[PDB]
PDB file of C-alpha atoms in Angstrom:
ATOM      1  CA  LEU K   1      -0.139  -0.350   0.138  1.00 51.55           C
ATOM      2  CA  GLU K   2       2.849   2.597   0.787  1.00 50.90           C
ATOM      3  CA  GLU K   3       4.230   1.041  -2.477  1.00 47.63           C
ATOM      4  CA  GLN K   4       1.111   1.914  -3.769  1.00 49.38           C
ATOM      5  CA  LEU K   5       1.341   5.559  -2.375  1.00 50.97           C
ATOM      6  CA  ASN K   6       4.177   6.688  -4.960  1.00 49.70           C
ATOM      7  CA  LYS K   7       3.122   4.622  -8.431  1.00 50.15           C
ATOM      8  CA  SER K   8       0.000   6.240  -8.482  1.00 50.17           C
ATOM      9  CA  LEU K   9       2.070  10.083  -7.409  1.00 52.52           C
ATOM     10  CA  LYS K  10       4.758   8.994 -10.285  1.00 52.72           C
ATOM     11  CA  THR K  11       1.850   8.851 -12.795  1.00 53.44           C
ATOM     12  CA  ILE K  12      -0.102  11.961 -11.554  1.00 52.03           C
ATOM     13  CA  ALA K  13       2.923  14.040 -12.271  1.00 52.88           C
ATOM     14  CA  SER K  14       3.078  12.321 -15.605  1.00 56.25           C
ATOM     15  CA  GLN K  15      -0.285  13.808 -16.162  1.00 59.87           C
ATOM     16  CA  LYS K  16       0.717  17.199 -14.321  1.00 58.07           C
ATOM     17  CA  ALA K  17       3.584  18.421 -16.595  1.00 57.70           C
ATOM     18  CA  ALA K  18       1.942  16.382 -19.425  1.00 55.94           C
ATOM     19  CA  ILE K  19      -0.736  19.862 -19.510  1.00 56.21           C
ATOM     20  CA  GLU K  20       1.809  21.984 -18.385  1.00 55.76           C
ATOM     21  CA  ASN K  21       3.647  21.275 -20.825  1.00 56.43           C
ATOM     22  CA  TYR K  22       1.039  21.188 -23.803  1.00 56.16           C
ATOM     23  CA  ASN K  23       0.398  24.871 -22.634  1.00 56.02           C
ATOM     24  CA  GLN K  24       3.711  25.492 -22.257  1.00 58.65           C
ATOM     25  CA  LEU K  25       3.913  24.991 -26.186  1.00 57.00           C
ATOM     26  CA  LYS K  26       0.227  26.345 -26.785  1.00 58.64           C
ATOM     27  CA  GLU K  27       1.413  29.462 -25.155  1.00 55.34           C
ATOM     28  CA  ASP K  28       4.136  29.729 -27.648  1.00 56.99           C
ATOM     29  CA  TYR K  29       2.102  28.510 -30.581  1.00 56.44           C
ATOM     30  CA  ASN K  30      -0.205  31.468 -30.092  1.00 56.93           C
ATOM     31  CA  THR K  31       2.916  33.308 -29.694  1.00 54.56           C
ATOM     32  CA  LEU K  32       3.300  33.015 -33.730  1.00 52.78           C
ATOM     33  CA  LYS K  33      -0.368  32.374 -34.435  1.00 50.94           C
ATOM     34  CA  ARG K  34      -0.728  36.521 -34.202  1.00 51.48           C
ATOM     35  CA  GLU K  35       2.920  37.306 -35.225  1.00 49.57           C
ATOM     36  CA  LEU K  36       1.777  35.211 -38.616  1.00 52.04           C
ATOM     37  CA  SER K  37      -1.779  36.970 -38.758  1.00 51.96           C
ATOM     38  CA  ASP K  38       0.654  40.263 -38.822  1.00 51.58           C
ATOM     39  CA  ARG K  39       2.913  38.996 -41.997  1.00 52.13           C
ATOM     40  CA  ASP K  40      -0.317  38.192 -43.392  1.00 48.27           C
ATOM     41  CA  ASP K  41      -1.944  41.117 -43.190  1.00 45.97           C
ATOM     42  CA  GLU K  42       0.855  43.625 -43.736  1.00 44.71           C
ATOM     43  CA  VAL K  43       1.358  41.509 -46.833  1.00 40.10           C
ATOM     44  CA  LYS K  44      -1.646  41.785 -47.638  1.00 42.39           C
ATOM     45  CA  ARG K  45      -1.406  45.871 -47.389  1.00 40.76           C
ATOM     46  CA  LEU K  46       1.748  46.289 -48.992  1.00 42.44           C
ATOM     47  CA  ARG K  47       0.453  43.915 -51.618  1.00 43.03           C
ATOM     48  CA  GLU K  48      -2.437  46.203 -52.230  1.00 41.31           C
ATOM     49  CA  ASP K  49      -0.054  49.526 -52.481  1.00 42.62           C
ATOM     50  CA  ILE K  50       2.176  48.450 -55.144  1.00 37.54           C
ATOM     51  CA  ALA K  51      -1.140  47.979 -57.503  1.00 38.65           C
ATOM     52  CA  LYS K  52      -2.116  51.143 -55.994  1.00 42.69           C
ATOM     53  CA  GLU K  53       1.157  52.232 -57.232  1.00 42.84           C
ATOM     54  CA  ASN K  54       1.574  50.636 -60.857  1.00 41.96           C
ATOM     55  CA  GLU K  55      -1.933  51.728 -61.839  1.00 39.83           C
ATOM     56  CA  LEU K  56      -1.570  55.458 -60.818  1.00 39.31           C
ATOM     57  CA  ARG K  57       1.995  55.081 -62.682  1.00 39.99           C
ATOM     58  CA  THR K  58       0.696  53.990 -66.124  1.00 37.51           C
ATOM     59  CA  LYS K  59      -1.378  56.606 -66.040  1.00 35.99           C
ATOM     60  CA  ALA K  60       1.316  59.187 -65.652  1.00 38.40           C
ATOM     61  CA  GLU K  61       3.458  57.499 -67.958  1.00 39.36           C
ATOM     62  CA  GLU K  62       1.411  56.798 -71.052  1.00 39.83           C
ATOM     63  CA  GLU K  63      -0.074  60.591 -70.441  1.00 41.10           C
ATOM     64  CA  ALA K  64       3.303  62.370 -69.760  1.00 40.75           C
ATOM     65  CA  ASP K  65       4.260  60.605 -72.743  1.00 39.47           C
ATOM     66  CA  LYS K  66       1.279  61.923 -74.781  1.00 38.06           C
ATOM     67  CA  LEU K  67       1.686  65.339 -73.317  1.00 38.44           C
ATOM     68  CA  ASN K  68       5.128  65.091 -74.417  1.00 38.17           C
ATOM     69  CA  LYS K  69       4.974  63.755 -77.803  1.00 31.77           C
ATOM     70  CA  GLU K  70       2.703  66.775 -78.218  1.00 32.09           C
ATOM     71  CA  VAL K  71       5.900  68.910 -77.297  1.00 35.26           C
ATOM     72  CA  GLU K  72       7.722  67.339 -79.101  1.00 35.87           C
ATOM     73  CA  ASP K  73       5.314  67.947 -82.129  1.00 37.35           C
ATOM     74  CA  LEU K  74       4.928  71.724 -81.133  1.00 39.80           C
ATOM     75  CA  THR K  75       8.636  72.263 -81.268  1.00 37.27           C
ATOM     76  CA  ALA K  76       9.510  70.755 -84.601  1.00 36.90           C
ATOM     77  CA  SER K  77       6.776  72.939 -85.871  1.00 41.17           C
ATOM     78  CA  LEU K  78       7.918  76.115 -83.886  1.00 41.46           C
ATOM     79  CA  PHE K  79      11.187  75.039 -85.371  1.00 40.16           C
ATOM     80  CA  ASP K  80      10.005  74.526 -88.811  1.00 42.28           C
ATOM     81  CA  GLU K  81       7.848  78.128 -89.170  1.00 42.56           C
ATOM     82  CA  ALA K  82      10.889  79.741 -87.114  1.00 42.64           C
ATOM     83  CA  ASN K  83      12.592  78.978 -90.499  1.00 40.55           C
ATOM     84  CA  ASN K  84      10.249  80.094 -92.995  1.00 38.10           C
ATOM     85  CA  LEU K  85      10.347  83.333 -91.101  1.00 37.42           C
ATOM     86  CA  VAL K  86      13.811  83.378 -92.562  1.00 38.98           C
ATOM     87  CA  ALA K  87      13.421  82.423 -95.825  1.00 36.03           C
ATOM     88  CA  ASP K  88      11.251  85.408 -96.903  1.00 34.81           C
ATOM     89  CA  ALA K  89      13.248  87.737 -94.300  1.00 37.42           C
ATOM     90  CA  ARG K  90      16.093  87.429 -96.154  1.00 37.70           C
ATOM     91  CA  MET K  91      14.654  86.750 -99.677  1.00 38.29           C
ATOM     92  CA  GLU K  92      12.653  90.047 -99.054  1.00 35.94           C
ATOM     93  CA  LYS K  93      16.144  91.530 -97.940  1.00 33.99           C
ATOM     94  CA  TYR K  94      17.632  91.245-101.203  1.00 32.72           C
ATOM     95  CA  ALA K  95      15.015  92.791-103.652  1.00 33.55           C
ATOM     96  CA  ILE K  96      14.867  95.851-101.572  1.00 32.39           C
ATOM     97  CA  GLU K  97      18.755  95.738-101.440  1.00 28.06           C
ATOM     98  CA  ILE K  98      19.243  95.367-104.876  1.00 28.41           C
ATOM     99  CA  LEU K  99      16.871  97.588-106.014  1.00 29.60           C
ATOM    100  CA  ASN K 100      18.306 100.175-103.895  1.00 33.32           C
ATOM    101  CA  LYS K 101      21.407  99.173-105.753  1.00 29.89           C
ATOM    102  CA  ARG K 102      19.663  99.117-109.328  1.00 29.40           C
ATOM    103  CA  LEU K 103      18.761 102.792-109.425  1.00 28.65           C
ATOM    104  CA  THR K 104      22.646 103.173-108.681  1.00 29.73           C
ATOM    105  CA  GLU K 105      24.131 100.850-111.602  1.00 30.78           C
ATOM    106  CA  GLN K 106      21.289 103.235-113.507  1.00 27.92           C
ATOM    107  CA  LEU K 107      22.569 106.614-112.321  1.00 27.54           C
ATOM    108  CA  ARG K 108      25.456 105.798-114.145  1.00 26.72           C
ATOM    109  CA  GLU K 109      23.697 105.689-117.110  1.00 25.60           C
ATOM    110  CA  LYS K 110      22.020 108.984-116.688  1.00 29.53           C
ATOM    111  CA  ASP K 111      24.675 111.380-114.725  1.00 29.20           C
ATOM    112  CA  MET K 112      27.304 111.244-118.108  1.00 31.18           C
ATOM    113  CA  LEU K 113      24.153 111.941-120.157  1.00 29.60           C
ATOM    114  CA  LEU K 114      24.041 115.387-117.957  1.00 28.52           C
ATOM    115  CA  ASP K 115      27.404 116.513-118.840  1.00 29.11           C
ATOM    116  CA  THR K 116      26.464 116.055-122.545  1.00 25.62           C
ATOM    117  CA  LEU K 117      22.896 116.838-122.813  1.00 24.99           C
ATOM    118  CA  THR K 118      24.542 120.206-121.724  1.00 24.32           C
ATOM    119  CA  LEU K 119      27.026 120.118-124.371  1.00 24.14           C
ATOM    120  CA  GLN K 120      23.997 120.383-126.798  1.00 27.78           C
ATOM    121  CA  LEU K 121      22.709 123.481-125.028  1.00 28.92           C
TER     122      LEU K 121
ATOM    123  CA  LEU A   1      -7.155 -10.712 -15.035  1.00 34.07           C
ATOM    124  CA  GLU A   2     -10.225  -8.819 -16.815  1.00 35.72           C
ATOM    125  CA  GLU A   3     -10.106  -6.298 -14.200  1.00 38.99           C
ATOM    126  CA  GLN A   4      -6.242  -5.285 -14.750  1.00 36.36           C
ATOM    127  CA  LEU A   5      -7.132  -6.342 -18.686  1.00 34.40           C
ATOM    128  CA  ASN A   6      -9.111  -2.882 -18.141  1.00 32.81           C
ATOM    129  CA  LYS A   7      -7.583   0.206 -16.471  1.00 29.50           C
ATOM    130  CA  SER A   8      -4.516  -0.757 -17.990  1.00 24.35           C
ATOM    131  CA  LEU A   9      -6.092  -0.419 -21.473  1.00 25.73           C
ATOM    132  CA  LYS A  10      -7.813   2.554 -20.575  1.00 28.55           C
ATOM    133  CA  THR A  11      -4.932   4.027 -18.529  1.00 27.43           C
ATOM    134  CA  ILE A  12      -2.711   2.865 -21.850  1.00 28.47           C
ATOM    135  CA  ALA A  13      -5.261   4.368 -23.886  1.00 29.03           C
ATOM    136  CA  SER A  14      -5.130   8.062 -22.596  1.00 27.93           C
ATOM    137  CA  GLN A  15      -1.495   7.673 -22.480  1.00 27.92           C
ATOM    138  CA  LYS A  16      -1.444   7.821 -26.072  1.00 29.61           C
ATOM    139  CA  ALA A  17      -3.821  10.385 -26.098  1.00 29.05           C
ATOM    140  CA  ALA A  18      -2.096  12.224 -24.127  1.00 27.20           C
ATOM    141  CA  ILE A  19       0.896  12.194 -26.271  1.00 28.94           C
ATOM    142  CA  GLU A  20      -0.430  12.196 -29.330  1.00 30.15           C
ATOM    143  CA  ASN A  21      -1.926  15.765 -28.344  1.00 27.88           C
ATOM    144  CA  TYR A  22       1.274  17.469 -28.053  1.00 28.97           C
ATOM    145  CA  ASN A  23       2.603  15.390 -31.011  1.00 25.12           C
ATOM    146  CA  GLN A  24      -0.031  16.667 -33.748  1.00 26.95           C
ATOM    147  CA  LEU A  25       0.390  20.236 -32.100  1.00 24.51           C
ATOM    148  CA  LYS A  26       4.502  20.395 -31.931  1.00 20.99           C
ATOM    149  CA  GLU A  27       4.031  19.228 -35.268  1.00 18.61           C
ATOM    150  CA  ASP A  28       1.610  22.061 -36.299  1.00 17.53           C
ATOM    151  CA  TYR A  29       3.908  24.464 -34.312  1.00 16.96           C
ATOM    152  CA  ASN A  30       7.066  23.937 -36.051  1.00 17.36           C
ATOM    153  CA  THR A  31       4.514  24.714 -39.300  1.00 17.77           C
ATOM    154  CA  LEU A  32       3.300  28.037 -37.885  1.00 20.22           C
ATOM    155  CA  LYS A  33       6.997  29.376 -37.169  1.00 20.29           C
ATOM    156  CA  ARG A  34       7.895  28.299 -40.850  1.00 20.23           C
ATOM    157  CA  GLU A  35       5.182  30.441 -42.530  1.00 20.48           C
ATOM    158  CA  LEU A  36       5.735  33.453 -40.220  1.00 22.22           C
ATOM    159  CA  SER A  37       9.419  32.688 -41.935  1.00 22.34           C
ATOM    160  CA  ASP A  38       8.223  32.230 -45.316  1.00 20.34           C
ATOM    161  CA  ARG A  39       6.335  35.400 -44.778  1.00 19.71           C
ATOM    162  CA  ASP A  40       9.140  37.408 -43.408  1.00 16.86           C
ATOM    163  CA  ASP A  41      10.690  36.642 -47.073  1.00 14.85           C
ATOM    164  CA  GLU A  42       7.188  37.795 -48.489  1.00 11.06           C
ATOM    165  CA  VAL A  43       7.533  41.154 -46.681  1.00 13.53           C
ATOM    166  CA  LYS A  44      11.346  41.326 -47.260  1.00 15.52           C
ATOM    167  CA  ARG A  45      10.779  41.249 -50.628  1.00 18.72           C
ATOM    168  CA  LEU A  46       8.123  43.338 -50.730  1.00 17.29           C
ATOM    169  CA  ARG A  47       9.953  46.387 -49.271  1.00 16.73           C
ATOM    170  CA  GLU A  48      12.959  45.564 -51.551  1.00 14.87           C
ATOM    171  CA  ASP A  49      10.892  46.247 -54.638  1.00 16.76           C
ATOM    172  CA  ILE A  50       9.606  49.726 -53.386  1.00 16.33           C
ATOM    173  CA  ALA A  51      12.949  50.368 -52.538  1.00 18.20           C
ATOM    174  CA  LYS A  52      14.531  50.231 -56.103  1.00 16.16           C
ATOM    175  CA  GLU A  53      11.162  50.537 -57.869  1.00 14.41           C
ATOM    176  CA  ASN A  54      11.120  54.071 -55.885  1.00 12.76           C
ATOM    177  CA  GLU A  55      14.795  54.668 -56.597  1.00 11.90           C
ATOM    178  CA  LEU A  56      13.921  53.864 -60.138  1.00  7.33           C
ATOM    179  CA  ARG A  57      11.289  56.581 -60.200  1.00  9.22           C
ATOM    180  CA  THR A  58      13.797  58.726 -58.974  1.00  9.84           C
ATOM    181  CA  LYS A  59      16.339  59.122 -61.890  1.00  9.65           C
ATOM    182  CA  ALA A  60      13.234  58.714 -64.409  1.00 13.38           C
ATOM    183  CA  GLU A  61      11.701  62.070 -62.605  1.00 16.44           C
ATOM    184  CA  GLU A  62      14.969  63.834 -62.439  1.00 15.44           C
ATOM    185  CA  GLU A  63      16.300  63.672 -65.897  1.00 14.48           C
ATOM    186  CA  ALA A  64      12.446  64.364 -66.751  1.00 15.45           C
ATOM    187  CA  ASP A  65      12.941  67.974 -65.564  1.00 15.84           C
ATOM    188  CA  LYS A  66      16.676  67.969 -66.892  1.00 16.99           C
ATOM    189  CA  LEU A  67      14.454  67.837 -70.413  1.00 17.56           C
ATOM    190  CA  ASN A  68      12.251  70.282 -70.371  1.00 14.56           C
ATOM    191  CA  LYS A  69      14.160  73.170 -69.202  1.00 15.25           C
ATOM    192  CA  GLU A  70      16.985  71.910 -72.109  1.00 13.56           C
ATOM    193  CA  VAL A  71      13.583  72.004 -74.010  1.00  9.89           C
ATOM    194  CA  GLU A  72      12.196  75.584 -72.606  1.00  8.95           C
ATOM    195  CA  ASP A  73      15.610  76.765 -72.792  1.00  5.14           C
ATOM    196  CA  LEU A  74      15.546  76.064 -76.844  1.00  5.12           C
ATOM    197  CA  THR A  75      12.096  76.982 -77.428  1.00  4.51           C
ATOM    198  CA  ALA A  76      12.194  80.326 -75.766  1.00  3.57           C
ATOM    199  CA  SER A  77      15.674  80.694 -77.129  1.00  3.26           C
ATOM    200  CA  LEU A  78      13.971  80.205 -80.668  1.00  2.00           C
ATOM    201  CA  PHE A  79      11.667  82.878 -80.090  1.00  2.00           C
ATOM    202  CA  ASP A  80      13.636  85.483 -79.538  1.00  3.32           C
ATOM    203  CA  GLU A  81      15.840  85.140 -82.630  1.00  2.00           C
ATOM    204  CA  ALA A  82      12.508  84.826 -84.342  1.00  2.00           C
ATOM    205  CA  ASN A  83      11.457  88.140 -82.232  1.00  2.00           C
ATOM    206  CA  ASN A  84      14.844  90.024 -82.596  1.00  2.00           C
ATOM    207  CA  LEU A  85      14.735  89.353 -86.396  1.00  2.00           C
ATOM    208  CA  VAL A  86      11.218  90.950 -87.461  1.00  2.00           C
ATOM    209  CA  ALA A  87      11.631  93.466 -84.938  1.00  2.00           C
ATOM    210  CA  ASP A  88      14.895  94.605 -86.596  1.00  2.00           C
ATOM    211  CA  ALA A  89      14.493  93.480 -89.691  1.00  2.00           C
ATOM    212  CA  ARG A  90      11.685  95.893 -90.078  1.00  2.00           C
ATOM    213  CA  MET A  91      14.561  98.870 -89.160  1.00  2.00           C
ATOM    214  CA  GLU A  92      16.601  98.243 -92.091  1.00  2.00           C
ATOM    215  CA  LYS A  93      13.160  98.051 -94.469  1.00  2.00           C
ATOM    216  CA  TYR A  94      12.245 101.998 -93.717  1.00  2.00           C
ATOM    217  CA  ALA A  95      15.790 102.741 -93.174  1.00  2.00           C
ATOM    218  CA  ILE A  96      16.964 101.542 -96.663  1.00  2.00           C
ATOM    219  CA  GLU A  97      13.095 102.584 -97.845  1.00  2.09           C
ATOM    220  CA  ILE A  98      13.886 106.316 -97.426  1.00  5.21           C
ATOM    221  CA  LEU A  99      17.258 105.927 -99.519  1.00  3.59           C
ATOM    222  CA  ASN A 100      15.255 104.214-102.276  1.00  2.00           C
ATOM    223  CA  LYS A 101      12.959 107.385-102.155  1.00  2.00           C
ATOM    224  CA  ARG A 102      15.655 109.725-102.679  1.00  2.00           C
ATOM    225  CA  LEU A 103      16.826 107.614-105.533  1.00  4.60           C
ATOM    226  CA  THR A 104      13.638 107.218-107.113  1.00  3.08           C
ATOM    227  CA  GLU A 105      12.509 111.033-106.899  1.00  2.00           C
ATOM    228  CA  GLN A 106      16.180 112.467-107.724  1.00  2.00           C
ATOM    229  CA  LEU A 107      15.769 110.545-110.709  1.00  2.00           C
ATOM    230  CA  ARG A 108      12.705 112.316-111.225  1.00  2.00           C
ATOM    231  CA  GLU A 109      14.942 115.319-110.189  1.00  2.00           C
ATOM    232  CA  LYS A 110      16.958 114.264-112.757  1.00  2.00           C
ATOM    233  CA  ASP A 111      14.588 114.792-115.330  1.00  2.00           C
ATOM    234  CA  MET A 112      13.130 118.139-114.263  1.00  2.97           C
ATOM    235  CA  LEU A 113      16.640 119.695-114.574  1.00  2.00           C
ATOM    236  CA  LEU A 114      16.733 117.640-117.599  1.00  2.00           C
TER     237      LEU A 114
END
Protein backbone atom coordinates (compact mmCIF):
# COMPACT_ATOMS: atom_id res chain seq x y z
CA LEU A 1 0.00 0.00 0.00
CA GLU A 2 2.81 2.43 0.84
CA GLU A 3 4.44 1.25 -2.38
CA GLN A 4 1.02 2.11 -3.82
CA LEU A 5 1.29 5.74 -2.63
CA ASN A 6 4.16 6.65 -4.95
CA LYS A 7 3.12 4.63 -8.02
CA SER A 8 -0.07 6.60 -8.56
CA LEU A 9 1.88 9.73 -7.55
CA LYS A 10 4.57 9.26 -10.19
CA THR A 11 1.67 8.98 -12.68
CA ILE A 12 -0.19 11.99 -11.28
CA ALA A 13 2.91 14.00 -12.18
CA SER A 14 3.27 12.52 -15.67
CA GLN A 15 -0.20 13.87 -16.13
CA LYS A 16 0.71 17.13 -14.48
CA ALA A 17 3.63 18.17 -16.62
CA ALA A 18 1.57 16.51 -19.36
CA ILE A 19 -0.72 19.51 -19.57
CA GLU A 20 1.67 22.03 -18.07
CA ASN A 21 3.82 21.41 -21.14
CA TYR A 22 1.05 21.33 -23.73
CA ASN A 23 0.15 24.83 -22.56
CA GLN A 24 3.86 25.69 -22.37
CA LEU A 25 3.67 25.03 -26.08
CA LYS A 26 0.24 26.37 -27.06
CA GLU A 27 1.11 29.62 -25.40
CA ASP A 28 4.13 29.88 -27.71
CA TYR A 29 2.03 28.52 -30.53
CA ASN A 30 -0.37 31.38 -30.06
CA THR A 31 2.77 33.52 -29.74
CA LEU A 32 3.13 32.73 -33.45
CA LYS A 33 -0.52 32.35 -34.49
CA ARG A 34 -0.62 36.17 -34.17
CA GLU A 35 2.80 37.13 -35.47
CA LEU A 36 1.75 35.25 -38.64
CA SER A 37 -1.56 37.06 -38.69
CA ASP A 38 0.70 40.08 -38.99
CA ARG A 39 2.90 39.11 -41.94
CA ASP A 40 -0.43 37.85 -43.33
CA ASP A 41 -1.98 41.34 -43.09
CA GLU A 42 1.32 43.23 -43.62
CA VAL A 43 1.65 41.40 -46.93
CA LYS A 44 -1.92 42.17 -47.95
CA ARG A 45 -1.44 45.92 -47.29
CA LEU A 46 1.92 46.29 -49.03
CA ARG A 47 0.66 43.90 -51.70
CA GLU A 48 -2.24 46.33 -52.39
CA ASP A 49 -0.28 49.56 -52.30
CA ILE A 50 1.77 48.14 -55.13
CA ALA A 51 -1.12 47.84 -57.56
CA LYS A 52 -2.08 51.23 -56.13
CA GLU A 53 1.29 52.44 -57.43
CA ASN A 54 1.58 50.68 -60.81
CA GLU A 55 -1.95 51.74 -61.83
CA LEU A 56 -1.50 55.43 -61.03
CA ARG A 57 2.02 55.14 -62.50
CA THR A 58 0.85 53.84 -65.88
CA LYS A 59 -1.59 56.77 -66.22
CA ALA A 60 1.24 59.22 -65.56
CA GLU A 61 3.68 57.29 -67.78
CA GLU A 62 1.31 57.08 -70.72
CA GLU A 63 -0.11 60.60 -70.28
CA ALA A 64 3.16 62.38 -69.57
CA ASP A 65 4.30 60.68 -72.75
CA LYS A 66 1.29 61.81 -74.76
CA LEU A 67 1.66 65.31 -73.35
CA ASN A 68 5.37 65.09 -74.13
CA LYS A 69 5.08 63.95 -77.67
CA GLU A 70 2.65 66.84 -78.13
CA VAL A 71 5.46 69.15 -77.10
CA GLU A 72 7.89 67.26 -79.29
CA ASP A 73 5.61 68.12 -82.21
CA LEU A 74 5.11 71.80 -81.33
CA THR A 75 8.87 72.10 -81.09
CA ALA A 76 9.56 70.79 -84.58
CA SER A 77 6.66 72.91 -85.76
CA LEU A 78 8.07 75.97 -84.01
CA PHE A 79 11.48 75.21 -85.41
CA ASP A 80 9.87 74.77 -88.82
CA GLU A 81 7.96 78.10 -89.06
CA ALA A 82 10.94 79.76 -87.49
CA ASN A 83 12.85 78.80 -90.66
CA ASN A 84 10.23 80.12 -93.09
CA LEU A 85 10.32 83.20 -91.00
CA VAL A 86 14.00 83.29 -92.08
CA ALA A 87 13.46 82.32 -95.73
CA ASP A 88 11.25 85.28 -96.54
CA ALA A 89 13.19 87.46 -94.07
CA ARG A 90 16.37 87.18 -96.09
CA MET A 91 14.72 86.77 -99.49
CA GLU A 92 12.82 90.07 -99.12
CA LYS A 93 16.02 91.75 -97.95
CA TYR A 94 17.56 91.23 -101.42
CA ALA A 95 14.96 92.61 -103.82
CA ILE A 96 15.09 95.79 -101.76
CA GLU A 97 18.85 95.87 -101.35
CA ILE A 98 19.28 95.14 -105.02
CA LEU A 99 16.52 97.61 -105.89
CA ASN A 100 18.35 100.22 -103.86
CA LYS A 101 21.42 99.14 -105.78
CA ARG A 102 19.63 99.09 -109.16
CA LEU A 103 18.96 102.79 -109.31
CA THR A 104 22.67 103.23 -108.60
CA GLU A 105 23.94 100.97 -111.40
CA GLN A 106 21.30 102.95 -113.27
CA LEU A 107 22.64 106.38 -112.27
CA ARG A 108 25.90 105.76 -114.19
CA GLU A 109 23.78 105.57 -117.36
CA LYS A 110 22.20 108.97 -116.69
CA ASP A 111 24.81 110.92 -114.67
CA MET A 112 27.13 110.94 -117.70
CA LEU A 113 24.08 112.05 -119.75
CA LEU A 114 23.92 115.46 -118.01
CA ASP A 115 27.51 116.51 -118.80
CA THR A 116 26.48 116.05 -122.46
CA LEU A 117 22.77 117.07 -122.53
CA THR A 118 24.46 120.33 -121.60
CA LEU A 119 27.00 119.84 -124.45
CA GLN A 120 24.14 120.51 -126.90
CA LEU A 121 22.56 123.36 -124.93
CA LEU B 1 -7.23 -10.58 -14.91
CA GLU B 2 -10.14 -8.80 -16.63
CA GLU B 3 -9.97 -6.02 -14.06
CA GLN B 4 -6.23 -5.63 -14.68
CA LEU B 5 -7.01 -6.05 -18.38
CA ASN B 6 -9.24 -2.99 -18.42
CA LYS B 7 -7.73 -0.11 -16.41
CA SER B 8 -4.32 -0.84 -17.90
CA LEU B 9 -5.82 -0.56 -21.43
CA LYS B 10 -7.63 2.65 -20.47
CA THR B 11 -4.58 4.06 -18.65
CA ILE B 12 -2.64 3.32 -21.80
CA ALA B 13 -5.42 4.59 -24.04
CA SER B 14 -5.26 7.99 -22.35
CA GLN B 15 -1.48 7.91 -22.38
CA LYS B 16 -1.49 7.66 -26.21
CA ALA B 17 -4.14 10.39 -26.60
CA ALA B 18 -2.05 12.33 -24.12
CA ILE B 19 1.06 12.15 -26.31
CA GLU B 20 -0.87 12.31 -29.59
CA ASN B 21 -1.88 15.82 -28.47
CA TYR B 22 1.65 17.18 -28.08
CA ASN B 23 2.81 15.48 -31.30
CA GLN B 24 0.12 16.72 -33.63
CA LEU B 25 0.49 20.10 -31.85
CA LYS B 26 4.28 20.52 -31.93
CA GLU B 27 3.79 19.31 -35.49
CA ASP B 28 1.40 22.26 -36.07
CA TYR B 29 3.88 24.55 -34.34
CA ASN B 30 6.93 23.90 -36.44
CA THR B 31 4.50 24.68 -39.28
CA LEU B 32 3.49 28.12 -37.98
CA LYS B 33 7.08 29.03 -37.20
CA ARG B 34 7.82 28.09 -40.87
CA GLU B 35 5.21 30.19 -42.59
CA LEU B 36 5.90 33.04 -40.21
CA SER B 37 9.37 32.72 -41.65
CA ASP B 38 8.11 32.36 -45.21
CA ARG B 39 6.18 35.64 -44.89
CA ASP B 40 9.16 37.45 -43.44
CA ASP B 41 10.60 36.66 -46.86
CA GLU B 42 7.51 37.71 -48.80
CA VAL B 43 7.64 41.02 -46.91
CA LYS B 44 11.40 41.55 -47.15
CA ARG B 45 10.97 40.99 -50.87
CA LEU B 46 8.15 43.54 -51.13
CA ARG B 47 10.07 46.15 -49.18
CA GLU B 48 13.01 45.29 -51.47
CA ASP B 49 11.11 46.25 -54.61
CA ILE B 50 9.40 49.42 -53.40
CA ALA B 51 13.04 50.41 -52.80
CA LYS B 52 14.60 49.86 -56.23
CA GLU B 53 11.25 50.68 -57.77
CA ASN B 54 11.09 54.01 -55.98
CA GLU B 55 14.78 54.62 -56.60
CA LEU B 56 14.05 54.12 -60.30
CA ARG B 57 11.10 56.50 -60.24
CA THR B 58 13.74 58.90 -58.91
CA LYS B 59 16.05 59.20 -61.94
CA ALA B 60 13.12 58.78 -64.33
CA GLU B 61 11.64 61.86 -62.64
CA GLU B 62 14.84 63.88 -62.36
CA GLU B 63 16.08 63.45 -65.89
CA ALA B 64 12.53 64.35 -66.78
CA ASP B 65 12.78 68.00 -65.69
CA LYS B 66 16.43 67.98 -66.80
CA LEU B 67 14.66 67.68 -70.16
CA ASN B 68 11.91 70.28 -70.12
CA LYS B 69 14.41 72.96 -69.23
CA GLU B 70 16.77 71.99 -72.06
CA VAL B 71 13.61 72.24 -74.19
CA GLU B 72 12.16 75.32 -72.55
CA ASP B 73 15.51 77.09 -73.07
CA LEU B 74 15.63 75.89 -76.63
CA THR B 75 12.10 77.00 -77.41
CA ALA B 76 12.15 80.49 -75.94
CA SER B 77 15.67 80.98 -77.44
CA LEU B 78 14.34 80.23 -80.88
CA PHE B 79 11.49 82.69 -80.24
CA ASP B 80 13.85 85.59 -79.49
CA GLU B 81 15.87 85.14 -82.65
CA ALA B 82 12.51 85.20 -84.44
CA ASN B 83 11.43 88.38 -82.72
CA ASN B 84 14.71 90.13 -82.59
CA LEU B 85 14.64 89.30 -86.31
CA VAL B 86 11.26 90.54 -87.51
CA ALA B 87 11.80 93.45 -85.15
CA ASP B 88 15.05 94.91 -86.50
CA ALA B 89 14.43 93.42 -89.95
CA ARG B 90 11.81 96.12 -90.17
CA MET B 91 14.24 98.80 -89.06
CA GLU B 92 16.28 98.04 -92.15
CA LYS B 93 13.14 98.22 -94.30
CA TYR B 94 12.11 101.83 -93.57
CA ALA B 95 15.84 102.72 -93.48
CA ILE B 96 16.60 101.29 -96.91
CA GLU B 97 13.10 102.54 -97.76
CA ILE B 98 14.04 106.22 -97.46
CA LEU B 99 17.25 105.55 -99.39
CA ASN B 100 15.08 104.30 -102.25
CA LYS B 101 12.95 107.44 -101.91
CA ARG B 102 15.75 109.90 -102.53
CA LEU B 103 16.84 107.66 -105.44
CA THR B 104 13.39 107.47 -107.10
CA GLU B 105 12.72 111.18 -106.64
CA GLN B 106 16.27 112.24 -107.65
CA LEU B 107 15.93 110.37 -110.93
CA ARG B 108 12.77 112.43 -111.49
CA GLU B 109 14.70 115.44 -110.16
CA LYS B 110 17.05 114.40 -112.95
CA ASP B 111 14.12 114.75 -115.38
CA MET B 112 13.07 118.27 -114.27
CA LEU B 113 16.62 119.66 -114.62
CA LEU B 114 17.06 117.62 -117.82
